Design a protein around this ligand. Structure first.
Ligand SMILES: Oc1cccc(-c2ccccc2)c1O
Ligand SMILES: Oc1cccc(-c2ccccc2)c1O
Ligand SMILES: Oc1cccc(-c2ccccc2)c1O
Ligand SMILES: Oc1cccc(-c2ccccc2)c1O
Ligand SMILES: Oc1cccc(-c2ccccc2)c1O
Ligand SMILES: Oc1cccc(-c2ccccc2)c1O
Ligand SMILES: [Fe+2]
Ligand SMILES: [Fe+2]
Ligand SMILES: [Fe+2]
Ligand SMILES: [Fe+2]
Ligand SMILES: [Fe+2]
Ligand SMILES: [Fe+2]
Lengths: 288, 288, 288, 288, 288, 288
């Protein structure tokens, strides 16, 4: 099974806007380029987020990490047994992604996924944020999370759990209208309360948002002011009912895709219990 | 196997007396109603104790929790293999209990049991006690415990251990007369020393008492005075030989059913050793 | 100023009853005799409590400790400046008390006080309780406390504070009748919330009670049962409003003198604030 | 497999000498009698050591504990599969030992062993030592250890490891003469470095010594002086090479059987490594 | 599988130079001799490094430790199943090495390996360094590590992982020339980030270096000055990218074999993730 | 006032015996020589103990340390005010002692004392013991203590307390005969329970012993065996009543002067209370 989410690649219409957004606002470190993709770092990894020009203005792919070569072969075995098509990344792709091996596939609804192992690290070029942020929480919990929009949650759940090995943490019925709600399913594959959430939202994007977790509450408070100065805030500060992450949301330069910047959630372990919530926030998160 | 005791439902002759008892005396939070049942909270769960009008003046049902949907199906499998009759709760029942799924059955002596998963939580309506209590110890250990009266302890033991997966912690020979004692069996299904105790007591109730655990010794001391002002104390403060819970007992408004309010017991783990005790109290607990 | 209360001497009508009481019930260690006085230990000191035959059935004297020879001379100076009569204990008395020096005086109402330094310790004869008690809290806080009955609290306060250097911690208005209360003044001379309390009670004894503090809550719980078996309990368990000591009271063999056996109070330091309380117990302590 | 050593029974020629030895010298608590056996406690168990009159002047039996009824049946299964004869203790024996069930057998060289579960505890009669000792280290590690004398170490090893489930910790070549040593094998069945050691010593006793572990270094220091006053010291203080227990040895009233009284050893876990030592002491333990 | 690296034996042209090097410079304790081999200690083991005269000027053998006799037989089984030739060490060899049993074999490229259990410890002769070093980090992590030079890394990897049970931690592409690098593979068999690294270096030695880990940073700083006074420094202080060991390198008296003396690395556990690095040092380690 | 004891100088008949004693037995580090004095280290100081040839076979001088130049002038002022003769050490003496300034005087009974400030430290030559000892406890508590023999304790007390600023910790009545004891006075000048003890012993030496404190209990245990192998033990292990130091005594090569090697005492602070003890040992210390 997948151990963690390791990287995200976006294809966007305004690369310079995304560059400024990820560095000056979010605080990531510019890390050069690979082909036509600009690279950004959040820690010791050579890169965590890639941005390339494209009309999609959406997530182009997500990198799903396993711990070793044997693990990758076991994932290939699971894909075969499940009847899910995949192709082994060639040398050129391996060099582009800076990984020792990868399998290329798509989830049931067209999102390209890359399962890999052996990512490149560059401790000789220590991480230096582009904006005031003490650091990000990554490590064994991966880069963060994202909310995957799907037309059929049941179908998506079977794939992510039965094929990829994610596990359901909980469900929140997100109110959409006076008498309409969407049952968002939050999935984990490590200690991070969720790495992927599945939701049947009526937005035309592959994802609703991606999330990064900072080391301190001040990191979040300061980031809010930066994104507010940029005119991008979409929610006030708040704390989630399920993971207890204290965060705020803001627009990325790609319409209808947001970023969530948070701190201090609960983590999960083998004794986790599935529960249901009627609200996304215990407090705050008022839409603006 | 059952992971923890999650809820209790009582059917009583004096609903207002029970309402005052659970709130003003015990300290639970009033949490509205579901049908003809008044609901009470002890933590983030939508409800923990339900009270409905009825001539029983007894425990009407107990909710036994598992961690996920797959776990519930495994319990259904165990019930089938054991020849124990059960029915799947319908949508109406699921909505009434605020759970994602449940199996309805009875123990060998008529106590209705409900095995469920996916309970509702309401962190947006933080718990607020109705009386001075810093909080209750629940979480992975569930709501508390209860002593189940049975006519045949051996038969009850086989069901709770072999079918439901509870495990014997220890036995206390509770003296009843000059030369008569009842071997009470204390069972765990998690870290709580016991969640259910089995005893062949000569009382006409399904249970002898239910127990709630508070966060501090002062919580217990203060609760004693509240219940004493209500004229309900049945024991002085004391500490148990087996779980080392420091508690007192008091009458509920239903004749012959007591409540135990305690603090600071030992917890169990895989290295627990079965032992036998000749007394229920290491000190205190004098009957009054 | 006085550093701590170090010893107590009682003159009683039933020495054997007191012997059994202090050892089998309270848990002190029998430590031989000095003249016609039986000696009892609570720690490394050669003795802490002395019991001698006498019709008083009361506290005969209290030993007030200072840290060195120079300190004792300074106390002699304070007594002289205050016009309080005193005599230096002779060699025989010094040997009897096992101290390097002492001043003999009385408080304004006839209670003999002995200010001393250099007490004897016997670490080669380690303390062994006569009943199950993990140990007592003494050290820099001394042996415990006692409530001194006085006819004139103002006069007593001036002596204990201005002459001996005790400091007021707080006051409790102890209800005596429907519209009658006694303002008990609690005084400290170290970290122990109080070492001496002053109160105008209508009892014919020099003191209302003496108090010993044990290391654990179980120590207290077990002691309660022992004293209850002896038929001596005067209060249920409870916790004080001012020092937060969790204790119970019981009769000593001397009529109208009680013992208090407690655990876990707050301690004081230079930042202590004088306050007033309307009750002696935050919870419990019901009279029996 | 055996979880821990729970009790020892001795048959001796001088019961009063053993009584004084275990209480006044070692510090155990006298705990009445069961038949012609005097009982002694070291903790919450109803008894840990039994002494009965007999010409053996040796260990009469050792109680080997398992955690539950199912565990005991599994041990019966292992004995059957191994061809080791055993008899189930009858009701009278169960009542005598204060256990819920037991299997009676002998090791390959005649030492009676009793495998049991469900021992009686008496927390309402808290442990009170007969001599100054803060307490003993028992719990999951059992009462202590003993060195079993055997004529054939290989044969003894196969039985204790293959049948009873003990595991080798290490070996010490104990020098007997100028060019003669005995390879003592130290075996564990829990965190205690060893519960039983096997050695081909030329003494006519079933065991060389039994060992008790106290809570503090002072406990050991004080016990040394007590046993020295009794004229029983056989070694000066010292510390073992293998378990790092700091102890001393002394004669019991039974010729050639010693007691070891120690503190502060290392404990073992799954990552333990078998090693060999050429000396029993890292320092001290000079024979006297 | 192998649990840890326990000992190293060198065959050298200048025994006196090696003796001075290991004692006065590195700080090991001289521990006598066994045959024509001089012995050196780093902890409680009778020996850790052996030096004997020989033209090789290289590592003569490496001792690979397992936890018990059964483990050794399992390793013999693995060797048989893998078709790897081995011989059981005879009594003379066992006595020479001070072990309870061993298997003698070679890795695919001629390095003699000895798999053993039951090493001798001498706690009665406590370790005393020959130079100022607070101590070495050994224990469950073994003596240290070494970099094994191999002509075929793939072949070496299959043997060390598939046969001996080592596990890949990570890979570093060590730059050799302007457009030439060697993929060094770092392998663990316990918490030590690596115990053996495999690299296709163009040096004529079996190993590139061996490494010892000291308790403090000062240990390393002081050792640097000692080796610098001896004219042996080959690198400045630095910290590795993969294990985060802070160290320096120096020449041993055998040409082209170095020693690494370090402190403070990260350790590994079951959740370790394979990664790739482009540099050996996060900082420092400049060649001199 | 004196801050701590910093150094000791001995004049002895057998320098080689003392050299072996201090290094191979006690564990001090040989530190060259200054004139005809051999120097020994216990920590970062250039020297702590000096040994020179002389018929005295006794302590020749003791170095008493203050924190700065101003402090030394204040001590000169106190000596003048007290009428105690002293001479300022000249440049040659300052260079010999490796100090920035010193005052030379004698105590009332002829022991030369040197009050100094600014001692030399040599961190570039880190301490390396000559025998297995993890280290000594020095720092702000100085090198250790010594027992000063005096003919008139009262006179000695006035000088050490009134002139030098030492403070009485406690008194022990050391039994000399059936009805004879000597009141030993233990004095502190920092956290070390005592730095100098005064006693009217009938020995012809300036001191009874000097004491060094090691970091661990094993340090003490190992040192005992070393001194026992040398045939120098004068007491078994034991623990003192007053400072709770766990130690043993041994003869130095100078007749009637002993060394005490200990661990783990209590320390003193401003809240220390003067007490009296009837024994030097709580346990152990039997004379041999
Ligand atoms: O991390 C999270 C935890 C809980 C809910 C959301 C969420 C809120 C609104 C829309 C979609 C998801 C979330 O992002
Ligand atoms: O929690 C508990 C632990 C031990 C005994 C009891 C008990 C006491 C009297 C009657 C029934 C049970 C109990 O409630
Ligand atoms: O320690 C104490 C703290 C507060 C009140 C009392 C007290 C209660 C009743 C009568 C007299 C004193 C006391 O003893
Ligand atoms: O606990 C122990 C640990 C190591 C050795 C012994 C031992 C010493 C002498 C004779 C027999 C055993 C021991 O008792
Ligand atoms: O411990 C280590 C960790 C990482 C790299 C090296 C290394 C550096 C240069 C040449 C060979 C190995 C190493 O020794
Ligand atoms: O450190 C110490 C603490 C207490 C007593 C002594 C002592 C014992 C015998 C003779 C002289 C002194 C001592 O050395
Ligand atoms: Fe989110
Ligand atoms: Fe209960
Ligand atoms: Fe009181
Ligand atoms: Fe032993
Ligand atoms: Fe290395
Ligand atoms: Fe001393």
């Amino acid at each position: 099974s997948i151990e963690r989410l390791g990287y995200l690649g976006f294809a966007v219409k305004d690369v310079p806007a995304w560059d400024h957004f990820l560095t000056k606002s979010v605080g990531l470190m510019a890390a050069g380029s690979a082909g036509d993709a600009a690279l950004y770092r959040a820690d010791q990894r050579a890169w965590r987020i890639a941005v390339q020009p494209g009309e999609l203005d959406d997530l182009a792919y997500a990198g799903l990490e396993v711990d070793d070569a044997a693990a990758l072969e076991r994932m290939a075995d699971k894909l075969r047994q499940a009847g899910v098509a995949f192709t082994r990344g060639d040398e050129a792709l391996m060099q582009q992604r800076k990984v020792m091996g990868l399998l290329c596939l798509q989830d049931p609804f067209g999102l390209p996924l890359e399962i890999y192992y052996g990512p490149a690290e560059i401790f000789h070029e220590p991480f230096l944020p582009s904006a005031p942020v003490s650091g990000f929480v990554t490590g064994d919990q991966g880069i963060g999370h994202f909310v995957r929009c799907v037309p059929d949650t049941a179908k998506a759940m079977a794939f992510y759990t039965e094929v990829l090995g994610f596990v359901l943490s909980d469900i929140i019925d997100i109110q959409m209208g006076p008498e309409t709600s969407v049952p968002a399913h939050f999935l984990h594959c490590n200690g991070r309360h969720h790495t992927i959430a599945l939701a049947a939202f009526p937005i035309p994007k592959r994802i609703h948002h991606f999330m990064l977790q900072a080391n301190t509450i001040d990191d979040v408070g300061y980031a809010f002011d930066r994104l507010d100065a940029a005119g991008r805030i979409t929610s006030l500060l708040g704390r989630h009912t399920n993971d207890q992450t204290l965060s705020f949301y803001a627009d990325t330069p790609s319409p209808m895709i947001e970023v969530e910047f948070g701190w201090g959630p609960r983590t999960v372990d083998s004794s986790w219990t599935v529960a249901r919530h009627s609200r996304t926030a215990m407090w705050g998160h008022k839409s603006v």
